[PDB]
Design a protein around this ligand. Structure first.
Ligand SMILES: Nc1nc2c([nH]c(=O)n2[C@H]2C[C@H](O)[C@@H](COP(=O)(O)O)O2)c(=O)[nH]1
Ligand SMILES: OC[C@H]1O[C@@](CO)(O[C@H]2O[C@H](CO)[C@@H](O)[C@H](O)[C@H]2O)[C@@H](O)[C@@H]1O
Ligand SMILES: [Mg+2]
Ligand SMILES: [Mg+2]
Length: 129
């Protein structure tokens, strides 16, 4: 079974809103809401990966960020390790840089059912802040 390391960024503004994108209809976890992110490549660290992925996907450079949660999840056809970075400072303004839907969502209003099931403990912990 495919085994992947994935780095994602929880992009939180000053009004307790998170920048959330929606996955393509033909992707793994199609049509789900997501934290921007993607696969950690050979030769790059988890910290470098979340910077690169947020630059590619939403056009920001995260800075002074922290590891909010790291977990493993077994999907029906792949195993992934997710690195959830809490990003409260960045350069740039997030947008749908890859043509994908993106918008600011209140943290209290997040519905874990809208996200991949791997995100369930993270969304709960975020609402604990
Ligand atoms: N980008 C992103 N991927 C997620 C999240 N939760 C989650 O299970 N995944 C999975 C879906 C994909 O299998 C993989 C991400 O890789 P891509 O973004 O390259 O598709 O990680 C998330 O919040 N953000
Ligand atoms: O691992 C993140 C953790 O490390 C600290 C320093 O103790 O921050 C460092 O690492 C971050 C991720 O690369 C950088 O963004 C940051 O500038 C650097 O100091 C903690 O702040 C953080 O919890
Ligand atoms: Mg991605
Ligand atoms: Mg990507």
């Amino acid at each position: 079974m495919k085994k992947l390391q994935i780095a994602v960024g929880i992009i939180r503004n000053e009004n307790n809103e998170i920048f959330i994108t929606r996955r393509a209809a033909d992707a793994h976890m199609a049509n789900k809401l997501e934290f921007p992110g993607g696969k950690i490549e050979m030769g790059e660290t988890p910290e470098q990966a979340v910077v690169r992925e947020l630059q590619e996907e939403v056009g920001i450079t995260p800075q002074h960020f922290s590891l909010f949660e790291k977990l493993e999840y077994e999907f029906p056809d792949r195993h992934i390790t997710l690195w959830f970075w809490l990003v409260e400072r960045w350069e740039g303004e997030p947008w749908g840089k890859e043509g994908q839907p993106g918008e600011w969502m209140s943290l209290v209003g997040l519905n874990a059912d809208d996200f991949p099931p791997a995100n369930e403990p993270v969304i709960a912990k975020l609402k604990r802040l």
